[PDB]
C-alpha cells in the first residue's frame, strides 16, 4: 500500500536522483554515451515530474492519491536507492569493466529507462491518461478490460490469477520467470503500459505464453537486460562465425525486438524487425541464412509451430530452465539469505544487508546475532538513508 505523494516527497526523491547522477558522472565510467543513457534519464524523469507537478498545480490532492503515481514514486525512490547502495556495495570494482557491479548498474539503468517510458506513457504532457491507455493488440486489449476495466495498474497476484484463466501458468517457477519478463519496472505491479509492451513482444495473444517460452525462457538466443552496446560486445567473440545472433528488447522502440547478427563479411549489425512477430522474423532469417547460431550455439531451435489454428503441443521446460532464466534479470536487490525478497534492512553494529523478512525469520527461531557474521544485532537501519 504505497502512500500518498506530495511535492516534499517528489523533491526528496529528486535529491536522491541527483546523488545517483553525481555517482555516474565519474569519468572512470564514461557513461556519457552508454545505451540506456543514465545521465540523460534521471534529468529527464526529473524534468517530466515537474511537468506533472505543474499540470496538477492546485490539484495536488488528486495527483497524490493516484494509485499509479503513488506506486511509481515509491518505486523511483526504491530504485534510486538500490543504485546508491550498488556503488557503495561494490566499491572500486565499479570502475573496473565487465564487473558485476557495473553489470548491475546497466540492469538498473535499463530499469530507469523503462520506468521513464511508462511514466511518459501514462502521463503524456503531464496529464494522467492511464484509464484510457490504448493497448495495441486488440485481443489483449479485451483481456484487460474484461479483467481490470480501466485500471492503470494491478498487483502481480491479481494479474497472475487473471491471466491464468486464459493462459494456464504451469507452476511455481514459471510464474516467477513470467514475472521477471513482464515487470519491466520491477515493482511487483503490472501497468497497462508494461502489459502492452509484453503483449506486443510475444504476440500473437492467441498463443501468448507459448511464444514466451519458445522465444525467451528456452531459446539460447534471447538475452535479458542487454543494451545495444553489450550485444555488439557479446557478438564480438563470434565475429568469425557469421550467422551468429542474439535478440533482445529494443530500448528505443519498446514493445519491439532488436536482433543482432554477425554478417558474412564479419560485421555485427542490429535490426528492429518491422510489422512481424519475432518468430516469423527468426524463422525467415534462418531460412534465408542470416540467423544460424543463437548466441553462437550450433543447434538453432525450430520455431515453426507457432503458426496456424491450434498450433501444436506445449514444449517441456524444466524447473531448472526457469531458475536459470530468473537469474538472468535483477537479483542484486535480492536478499542473499532467501534469494527472493528485496534487501530492505541493514543490520547495524556490523553492516550486513538482508530482507527484513529473513532477519525476523531467523530471530524467531532464535538465531544468535547476524545471519552473516553471527555478531550481536543492536539495531537495524535503512540500506540507504533519506537525503540529509
Amino acid at each position: 500500500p504505497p502512500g500518498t505523494v506530495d511535492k516534499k516527497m517528489v523533491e526528496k526523491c529528486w535529491k536522491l536522483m541527483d546523488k545517483v547522477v553525481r555517482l555516474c558522472q565519474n569519468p572512470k565510467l564514461a557513461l556519457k554515451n552508454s545505451p540506456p543513457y543514465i545521465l540523460d534519464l534521471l534529468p529527464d524523469t526529473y524534468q517530466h515530474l515537474r511537468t506533472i507537478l505543474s499540470r496538477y498545480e492546485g490539484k495536488m490532492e488528486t495527483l497524490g492519491e493516484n494509485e499509479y503515481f503513488r506506486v511509481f514514486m515509491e518505486n523511483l525512490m526504491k530504485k534510486t536507492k538500490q543504485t546508491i547502495s550498488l556503488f557503495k556495495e561494490g566499491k572500486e570494482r565499479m570502475y573496473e569493466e565487465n564487473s558485476q557491479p557495473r553489470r548491475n548498474l546497466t540492469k538498473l539503468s535499463l530499469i530507469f529507462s523503462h520506468m521513464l517510458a511508462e511514466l511518459k506513457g501514462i502521463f503524456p504532457s503531464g496529464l494522467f491518461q492511464g484509464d484510457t491507455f490504448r493497448i495495441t493488440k486488440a485481443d489483449a486489449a479485451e483481456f484487460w478490460r474484461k479483467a481490470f476495466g480501466e485500471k492503470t495498474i494491478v498487483p502481480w497476484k491479481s494479474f497472475r490469477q487473471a491471466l491464468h484463466e486464459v493462459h494456464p501458468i504451469s507452476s511455481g517457477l514459471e510464474a516467477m520467470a513470467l514475472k521477471s519478463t513482464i515487470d519491466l519496472t520491477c515493482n511487483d505491479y503490472i501497468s497497462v503500459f508494461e502489459f502492452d509492451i509484453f503483449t506486443r513482444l510475444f504476440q500473437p495473444w492467441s498463443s501468448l505464453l507459448r511464444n514466451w517460452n519458445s522465444l525467451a525462457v528456452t531459446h539460447p538466443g534471447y538475452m535479458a537486460f542487454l543494451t545495444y552496446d553489450e550485444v555488439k560486445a557479446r557478438l564480438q567473440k563470434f565475429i568469425h562465425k557469421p550467422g551468429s545472433y542474439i535478440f533482445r528488447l529494443s530500448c528505443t522502440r519498446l514493445g519491439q525486438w532488436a536482433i543482432g547478427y554477425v554478417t558474412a563479411d564479419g560485421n555485427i549489425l542490429q535490426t528492429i524487425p518491422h510489422n512481424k512477430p519475432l518468430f516469423q522474423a527468426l524463422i525467415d532469417g534462418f531460412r534465408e541464412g542470416f540467423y544460424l547460431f543463437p548466441d553462437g550455439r550450433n543447434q538453432n531451435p525450430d520455431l515453426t509451430g507457432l503458426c496456424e489454428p491450434t498450433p501444436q503441443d506445449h514444449i517441456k521446460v524444466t524447473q531448472e530452465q526457469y531458475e536459470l532464466y530468473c537469474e538472468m534479470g535483477s537479483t542484486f536487490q535480492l536478499c542473499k539469505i532467501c534469494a527472493e525478497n528485496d534487501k530492505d534492512v541493514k543490520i547495524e553494529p556490523c553492516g550486513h544487508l538482508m530482507c527484513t523478512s529473513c532477519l525476523t525469520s531467523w530471530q524467531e527461531s532464535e538465531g544468535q546475532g547476524c545471519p552473516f557474521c553471527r555478531c550481536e544485532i543492536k539495531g537495524t537501519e535503512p540500506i540507504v538513508v533519506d537525503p540529509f
Binding site: 552496446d229 535490426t271 542470416f290
Partner: peptide
C-alpha cells in the same frame, strides 16, 4: 554511436 540497420537481405 549505435546504428540500427534494415532487416537482413
Amino acid at each position: 554511436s549505435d546504428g540500427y540497420t534494415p532487416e537482413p537481405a
